[PDB]
Amino acid sequence: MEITPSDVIKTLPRQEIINLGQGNPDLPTPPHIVEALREASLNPSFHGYGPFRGYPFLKEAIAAFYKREYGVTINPETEVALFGGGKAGLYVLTQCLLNPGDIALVPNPGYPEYLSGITMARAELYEMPLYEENGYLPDFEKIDPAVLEKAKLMFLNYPNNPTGAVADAAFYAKAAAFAKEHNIHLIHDFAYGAFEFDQKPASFLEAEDAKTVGAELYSFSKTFNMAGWRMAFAVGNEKIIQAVNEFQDHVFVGMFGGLQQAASAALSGDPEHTESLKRIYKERIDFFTALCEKELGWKMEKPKGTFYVWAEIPNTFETSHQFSDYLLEHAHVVVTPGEIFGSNGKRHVRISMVSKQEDLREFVTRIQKLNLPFG
């Protein structure tokens, strides 16, 4: 009788043909990042253990990146921690900031792994609904004042998975001011922060009192098509980072020097690379949503951010799950049912613009042979 712990058994199975499901970038990592890894790997200094907290040269790159892109001042020796990807960062941050029985404030809809780190910390979730009428921003006023004392952590995510909503500096000032009043650690998930199409994407850390209450998680995965490389960092409050450092001292010994060099080449590289990629996603979104309306009758929002389209399922379907499953079965295409993002996602699917045109057209046309009432 092998016995898993309560943590394991209460965790859900992870839910992640034309695949417009997983948000897996299809374009390669830029060549200069690959060359940096290839070159660094020859350096025997990286074959052995290095600094537990990661190399200074990477932490210096991170601060310089945050100054260049967002005008934010980051002390690299104290306000930066490294993670093996944003998924691991979310987990570490949650374990460092939540005790069993504390309340975590989580958007609905929202990235499903927020709920999961909260579960391994044995904490209680309280939902902040995201409604289109509010621009998919939370109404902090509608949170039960009784939970606020017990609420220790809040998750926010803009540009937003799965809705593509964006937030401006005034929303972040309000969020931080709210978090301050109620002693809530605020984690901003900036995994799509390269991808706001109209305005320059604003960091949470531009807002007054942001660094006081919280931190920003930045992934390499989407910005630089480095999803496979498993690299991320957090920037923010010095106390948060010290806690992270203390946890990770027992769990890791930094990460391969070659990867860190590659990450340093990514951050200091020309921004024109990322803008080009942003242009590619933008053109695919125009292609896709125009062809959907014209050839199917499916009227879709164009997202303000990210490479995701959030579309309403036909009136004749029970749940996003069945609709999703109808498409995989009969049309042989993958979309992500909105339900995995929370109850507020029912009746929507998330569709990822991580395929080239040829696959996006064949998506639409395969679905035409189904003649659904998108009207």
Give the N- to C-terminal CA distance of the chain in Å, as an integer: 55
Residues in the chain: 375
What residues have CB less than 8 Å from 262, skipping those under 6 apart?
A: 33, 34, 36, 37, 40, 226, 229
Of 18 and 232, the one with the shorter C-beta distance to ligand PLP is: 232
Pairing of strands 185-189, 214-219: parallel
The pair of structure tokens assigned to 349 is 């699917």
CA distance 41 to 47: 8
Least gap, CB of 274 to its own copies (angstroms):
15
> Contacts from 130-138 at CB under 8 Å and sequence distance 24+?
130/160, 130/163, 130/165, 130/344, 131/344, 135/165, 136/160, 136/163, 136/165, 137/165, 137/167, 137/171, 138/107
Q: Among ligand PLP, its own copies, none, what binds residue 252 when CB lies within 5 to 8 Å by partner kind?
A: its own copies
The site map against ligand PLP for 111-140 (x = CB under 6 A) is x-----------------------------
The site map against ligand PLP for 156-185 (x = CB under 6 A) is -x---x------------------------
For residue 205, give the DSSP letter. G
Q: Which of 87, 182, 284, 350 binds ligand PLP (CB under 6 A)?
A: 87
Is residue 341 within the footprint of ligand PLP (CB under 6 A)? no
Phi, psi angle pair for 24, to nearest 5°: -95, 110
CA distance 186 to 103: 13
CA distance 358 to 356: 6
Q: Which of 175, 191, 335, 340 binds ligand PLP (CB under 6 A)?
A: 191
The pair of structure tokens assigned to 117 is 């780190």
Size of the site for ligand PLP (CB under 6 A): 13
Q: Which of 189, 196, 216, 339 binds ligand PLP (CB under 6 A)?
A: 189
Residues within window 142-161 making contact with ligand PLP, judged by CB under 6 A: 157, 161
Q: Among ligand PLP, its own copies, none, what binds residue 149 when CB lies within 5 to 8 Å by partner kind?
A: none
Q: Which residue has the tokens 């010095």?
A: 238
Of 16 and 139, the one with the shorter C-beta distance to its own copies is: 16
Q: Among its own copies, ligand PLP, none, what binds residue 157 when CB lies within 5 to 8 Å by partner kind?
A: ligand PLP
Phi, psi angle pair for 334, to nearest 5°: -105, 120
Of 116 and 160, the one with the shorter C-beta distance to its own copies is: 116
Least gap, CB of 253 to ligand PLP (angstroms):
6
Of 69 and 216, the one with the shorter C-beta distance to ligand PLP is: 216
Least gap, CB of 370 to ligand PLP (angstroms):
28
107-122 exposure pattern, b = at least 16 Cβ within 10 A, e = fewer: bbbbbbbbbbbbbbbe
| Residue 207: closest CA among 177, 185, 183, 235 | 177
Is residue 107 within the footprint of ligand PLP (CB under 6 A)? no
Least gap, CB of 28 to its own copies (angstroms):
4
CA distance 138 to 221: 26
Q: Tell me, what amino acid is at 181?
A: E
Is residue 23 within the footprint of ligand PLP (CB under 6 A)? yes
The site map against ligand PLP for 198-237 (x = CB under 6 A) is ---------------------x-x-----x----x-----
CA distance 59 to 53: 9
Q: Among ligand PLP, its own copies, none, what binds residue 246 when CB lies within 5 to 8 Å by partner kind?
A: its own copies
Q: Rule CB under 6 A: which residues touch ligand PLP? A: 23, 85-87, 111, 157, 161, 189, 191, 219, 221, 227, 232
